[PDB]
Every structure is written in C-alpha cells, then in structure tokens.
Amino acid sequence: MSVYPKALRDEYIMSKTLGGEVKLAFERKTCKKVAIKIISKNVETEIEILKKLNHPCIIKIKNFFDAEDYYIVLELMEGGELFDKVVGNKRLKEATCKLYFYQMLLAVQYLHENGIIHRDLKPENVLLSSQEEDCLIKITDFGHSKILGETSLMRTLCGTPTYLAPEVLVSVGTAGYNRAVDCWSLGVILFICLSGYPPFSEHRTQVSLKDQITSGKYNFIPEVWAEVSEKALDLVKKLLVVDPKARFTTEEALRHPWLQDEDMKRKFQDLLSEENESTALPQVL
Amino acid sequence: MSVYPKALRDEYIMSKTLGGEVKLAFERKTCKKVAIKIISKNVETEIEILKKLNHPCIIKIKNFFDAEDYYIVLELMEGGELFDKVVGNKRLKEATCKLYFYQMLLAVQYLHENGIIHRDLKPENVLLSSQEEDCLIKITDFGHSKILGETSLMRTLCGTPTYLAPEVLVSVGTAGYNRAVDCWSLGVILFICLSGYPPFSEHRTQVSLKDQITSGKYNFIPEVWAEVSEKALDLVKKLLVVDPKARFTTEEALRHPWLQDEDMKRKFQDLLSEENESTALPQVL
Numbered sequence: 001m002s003v004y005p006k007a008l009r010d011e012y013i014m015s016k017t018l019g020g021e022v023k024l025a026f027e028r029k030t031c032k033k034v035a036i037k038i039i040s041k042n043v044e045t046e047i048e049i050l051k052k053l054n055h056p057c058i059i060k061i062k063n064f065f066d067a068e069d070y071y072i073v074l075e076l077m078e079g080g081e082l083f084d085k086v087v088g089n090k091r092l093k094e095a096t097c098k099l100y101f102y103q104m105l106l107a108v109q110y111l112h113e114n115g116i117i118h119r120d121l122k123p124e125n126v127l128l129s130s131q132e133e134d135c136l137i138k139i140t141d142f143g144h145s146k147i148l149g150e151t152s153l154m155r156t157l158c159g160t161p162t163y164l165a166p167e168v169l170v171s172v173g174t175a176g177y178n179r180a181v182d183c184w185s186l187g188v189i190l191f192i193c194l195s196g197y198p199p200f201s202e203h204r205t206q207v208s209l210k211d212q213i214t215s216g217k218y219n220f221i222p223e224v225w226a227e228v229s230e231k232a233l234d235l236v237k238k239l240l241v242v243d244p245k246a247r248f249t250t251e252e253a254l255r256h257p258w259l260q261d262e263d264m265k266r267k268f269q270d271l272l273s274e275e276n277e278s279t280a281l282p283q284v285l
Numbered sequence: 286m287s288v289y290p291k292a293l294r295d296e297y298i299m300s301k302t303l304g305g306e307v308k309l310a311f312e313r314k315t316c317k318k319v320a321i322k323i324i325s326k327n328v329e330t331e332i333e334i335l336k337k338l339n340h341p342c343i344i345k346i347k348n349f350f351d352a353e354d355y356y357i358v359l360e361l362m363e364g365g366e367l368f369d370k371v372v373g374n375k376r377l378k379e380a381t382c383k384l385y386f387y388q389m390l391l392a393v394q395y396l397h398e399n400g401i402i403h404r405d406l407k408p409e410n411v412l413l414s415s416q417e418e419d420c421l422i423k424i425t426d427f428g429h430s431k432i433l434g435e436t437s438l439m440r441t442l443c444g445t446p447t448y449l450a451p452e453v454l455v456s457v458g459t460a461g462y463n464r465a466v467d468c469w470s471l472g473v474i475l476f477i478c479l480s481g482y483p484p485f486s487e488h489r490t491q492v493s494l495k496d497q498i499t500s501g502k503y504n505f506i507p508e509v510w511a512e513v514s515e516k517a518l519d520l521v522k523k524l525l526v527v528d529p530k531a532r533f534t535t536e537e538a539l540r541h542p543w544l545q546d547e548d549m550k551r552k553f554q555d556l557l558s559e560e561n562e563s564t565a566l567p568q569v570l
C-alpha cells in the first residue's frame with residue numbers, strides 16, 4: 001500500500017473515502033469534519049483561483065499540501081454530489097431545480113464577474129450542503145477553469161494589420177464569448193434536473209452526439225416535459241442556443257420569469273443565514 | 286539621464302544605438318562586436334525559446350541581464366534590417382528575393398518543426414548579415430511568439446461531450462492551423478520584396494484594410510509585376526490564400542518551382558561555410 005505525508009498527518013486525522021480521490025478527515029485543532037482532495041503527480045493555478053474567490057455557492061480551500069501528491073483541504077458538503085440525485089432517470093421537484101439553479105447562476109455570475117470560466121460544469125461538480133432537499137449548493141472542481149486576463153488579440157489589434165492573417169481579423173467578432181461555454185453547461189444541467197434525462201445522447205438515436213450538439217437539436221420527450229412548466233423549459237431553450245453571442249448570459253437567466261420567484265429567493269436567504277449563524281460576530285449598530 | 290547595470294558593464298563596453306532599443310557593444314573577453322536589446326520593465330518565455338533554438342537563420346542569445354530593465358545580448362547583424370532595403374518603393378532584385386525568402390522559409394520551417402509560431406514576421410524582424418546583397422539572413426524578435434505544447438482541446442475531447450458547448454466542437458475543424466499565420470506574413474513579406482509596395486494598404490483605396498485582408502484581395506499593379514516572373518507571383522498567390530487550411534505550408538513553399546533553383550541554393554551553402562569557417566574544429570576522417 002502507501003502513507004499520508006507527515007505534515008498532513010500533523011494537522012488532520014484521515015478517514016473514509018467520499019468519492020480525483022476525495023477523503024473525509026478531521027481537523028485536529030477544531031475536531032471538525034473536512035474533505036481532502038488527493039491529486040496524483042495546473043493544480044497551483046486551481047489553488048490560486050480558489051484562494052481568491054469568495055462566494056457562498058463556490059467551495060473554499062482551507063489548506064494545501066504539495067507532497068508526493070497534491071492534497072487540497074476543502075469544506076465538507078454532507079449532501080454529496082448533485083449527480084447522485086439525477087442518476088437513473090431520477091427527476092428533481094421543479095421547485096428544488098429552481099433553488100439549486102438560482103445558486104448555480106449566482107456562482108457562475110460571480111466567476112464571470114471575476115474573470116473566471118469554470119469550463120467543466122456538470123452534476124458531479126455541484127455539491128449539496130445537507131441531505132435535506134432545500135439546501136445550499138456549491139460549485140467545485142476548478143481544475144479545467146481559465147482566467148480571462150489580457151488577450152494577445154487586444155495587443156495584436158493595437159498594431160497595423162499590414163502583415164496580419166485574415167483568420168485573426170475574423171476571430172475579432174466572436175472574441176470574448178468563451179464564458180458562454182459555462183451557460184451552455186448550465187442549460188444541459190437544468191435539462192437533466194427538470195427531465196431526469198440528458199438532452200444530447202447516443203441512446204435510442206441514429207444522429208451522432210456531435211451532430212446533435214452542433215445543430216443544437218435536443219431530444220424533446222413531450223410526456224416527460226408536460227410535468228414541467230412552460231417558463232422552466234423557455235429558459236432551457238434560451239441557454240441551449242447554438243450561437244454563443246445570442247446564448248443567454250447568467251444576468252439574462254437571473255432576469256428570466258422562471259427565477260422571478262420570491263418564495264425560492266426567501267428559502268435561499270434563510271439557508272444562508274442558517275449557515276452564517278455560526279460565523280456571526282456582534283454588530284456595531 | 287541614467288546608467289547601465291554593473292553586471293552588464295563588467296562584461297561589455299556599451300556603444301552607439303543600432304535601432305525595443307538595440308545598442309552596439311563589445312564583449313571585453315573577445316573584443317568582438319555584439320548587439321544588446323534593452324526591454325523596459327513574456328521576456329523570460331522569449332529567452333527560453335531563443336536558448337533552445339539552433340538554426341543559422343534564427344538569431345542566437347549570447348547573454349541575458351535581469352536588471353531595472355531586461356538586457357538581451359544577441360549576435361550582431363551588420364547588414365541591418367531588411368526593412369531598410371524595401372522602404373520608399375525600393376525593389377529587391379528577383380534573385381536577392383529568392384535567396385532571402387528561401388532562408389526565411391528554412392527558418393520558419395525549423396520553428397514549426399520545433400513547435401514555435403513567430404506571430405510577428407515583418408521586414409523589421411528579418412536581419413541581414415552584411416552590407417553585401419548576397420548574404421545570410423536571420424529571423425529576430427520572438428517577443429510575440431507562441432509554443433504549440435499540449436492543447437486543452439485534446440484534453441476536452443478525451444471526455445464525453447454531454448455538457449460540451451457546440452462552438453468547441455466547431456473549432457475542432459480549424460484547430461492546429463495557427464502556424465499558418467506565419468505563412469500569411471511570409472507571403473506579405475515576399476510581395477513587398479518583389480514589388481516594392483504592400484499588398485494591403487489604405488493608400489489610394491476606398492476599401493478598408495480589414496476588408497482587403499479578409500477577402501484576400503491584394504492590390505495587383507500589372508506594370509510593377511511585369512518585371513517579376515510568373516513563378517514568383519504564383520508562390521505569393523499560394524501564400525496569400527484566405528483559408529488557413531488551404532494556405533501553403535513552409536514545406537509546400539520550399540517545394541514550389543520558384544525555389545527549385547540550384548544556383549540560389551549553392552550561394553546560400555557558400556555563405557554558410559564562409560560564416561562557419563571561423564567555428565571550424567578539425568575533422569576525424
């Protein structure tokens with residue numbers, strides 16, 4: 001077999017596997033439960049992003065160990081992955097979909113505002129805070145995430161194009177819509193949550209999965225969707241748009257009539273203050 | 286005014302400006318002339334590329350100083366920039382064009398073979414070895430150059446595209462033709478050398494420089510080009526192709542009938558052994 005590093009061991013009492021390998025552990029100082037993600041020897045860039053982000057719907061780094069393997073100490077999410085709530089045609093309640101999606105939009109909006117594109121949004125990277133259906137969700141796994149920074153295209157455009165290739169000038173029209181990939185993913189997530197099935201699949205189809213996606217022709221099953229509201233499906237349709245320039249942004253999605261739900265918003269604010277009740281320092285007044 | 290760093294000063298006797306600021310200097314050890322490029326405080330990446338490249342038509346780093354400014358010690362090219370031979374409608378002899386272009390193709394072929402895209406090829410970055418028209422040329426300024434490495438697209442394609450945005454699947458067709466930007470630039474260079482004028486310009490034209498380039502509709506002046514061979518112009522036409530997938534590669538260009546010139550090839554081999562006569566260590570036999 002093999003051992004954990006002395007420095008990890010010094011600080012945490014390592015326990016059972018949760019689900020990259022993720023294990024349960026206990027901070028010795030606090031006796032509190034943590035999740036430790038092991039990555040066998042991009043991880044530095046992931047730590048750099050996660051250290052600077054600060055949102056209740058984005059996972060927080062608690063510690064990091066650069067040993068024979070990387071060890072990332074994260075906050076423990078007792079509800080597990082959202083994937084385990086959607087597998088085997090399991091259909092989430094329309095209201096539960098909204099509460100979770102609203103949080104995913106808030107998290108992805110924060111990311112975009114801060115110049116971060118996740119690039120790998122799926123149910124397996126959306127964690128639930130408790131075994132309760134009305135709970136806080138957090139976006140995890142920033143391993144494939146990208147930083148928007150300062151484009152080499154903006155620098156190239158400052159010059160004279162005497163020697164500039166045409167394809168570079170053609171890319172100017174689309175440039176800066178990479179974040180739209182995160183809205184596609186959210187749309188595929190919302191579809192799976194609402195219906196219990198994926199929009200693009202090789203199951204009972206002749207058309208290749210690639211052709212389905214490029215044509216943006218999702219598998220629509222009327223019997224399944226008759227249970228879902230017209231508003232929920234309208235948002236799906238608006239995110240599953242092929243043109244990344246026309247596709248709905250996180251701001252447009254958050255403005256959609258489906259998310260204009262004062263009850264759902266109240267429940268989220270309530271879950272937030274319930275979580276925050278622990279951190280609560282006395283107020284000035 | 287201001288001073289040079291003690292470490293630079295220790296090794297070189299700094300002299301007159303040559304032309305980023307480039308100054309003449311003398312290595313104290315050898316009493317030999319060098320060119321020192323000063324960059325005021327990407328430069329590390331430029332040094333990393335230039336340290337690993339090894340071709341007679343690519344400039345070599347001799348030293349580097351990371352001071353209040355960057356100081357890059359390069360080999361001195363007495364012929365200066367090719368730009369100074371093409372300004373003010375100055376037309377290079379068809380044979381001189383070939384000798385220089387053949388070397389530019391050999392240099393750019395080496396770059397591509399080694400996973401480097403220059404991204405800023407122009408007459409001002411092509412240096413001449415002597416004041417003689419039959420001379421060795423060297424490609425300089427790797428400041429905007431890029432490394433091909435390991436694409437995130439190849440990593441993304443290893444997964445299932447259930448959640449993958451359509452535009453990512455659409456980019457798969459063009460992916461890996463970025464090097465073709467270097468062949469466009471060479472084509473714009475060859476045109477300027479042969480004709481004395483640029484193919485795409487705002488001078489005596491209604492059509493925007495952008496529109497000219499995307500349509501690939503170069504300004505063709507028959508009287509000017511009647512002096513130039515049909516073969517020379519055929520190669521230009523093959524490099525000034527809008528589709529980066531159809532555009533001529535450095536290998537295709539080097540195979541073109543215009544470069545199938547045994548005389549031109551002989552003269553280059555002769556200039557090479559003339560340069561190499563100094564470095565010459567005794568042979569084993």
Ligand SMILES: Cc1cc(-c2ccccc2)[nH]n1
Pocket residue numbers: 018019022035037059074075076077078079080081127140
């Ligand atoms: C980063 C992380 C992973 C987890 C987790 C907890 C239980 C089951 C599955 C996953 N919490 N936090």
Ligand SMILES: Cc1cc(-c2ccccc2)[nH]n1
Pocket residue numbers: 303304307320322344359360361362363364365366412425
């Ligand atoms: C890198 C470099 C620059 C030069 C140079 C020499 C004379 C005139 C203009 C430029 N040689 N090498």
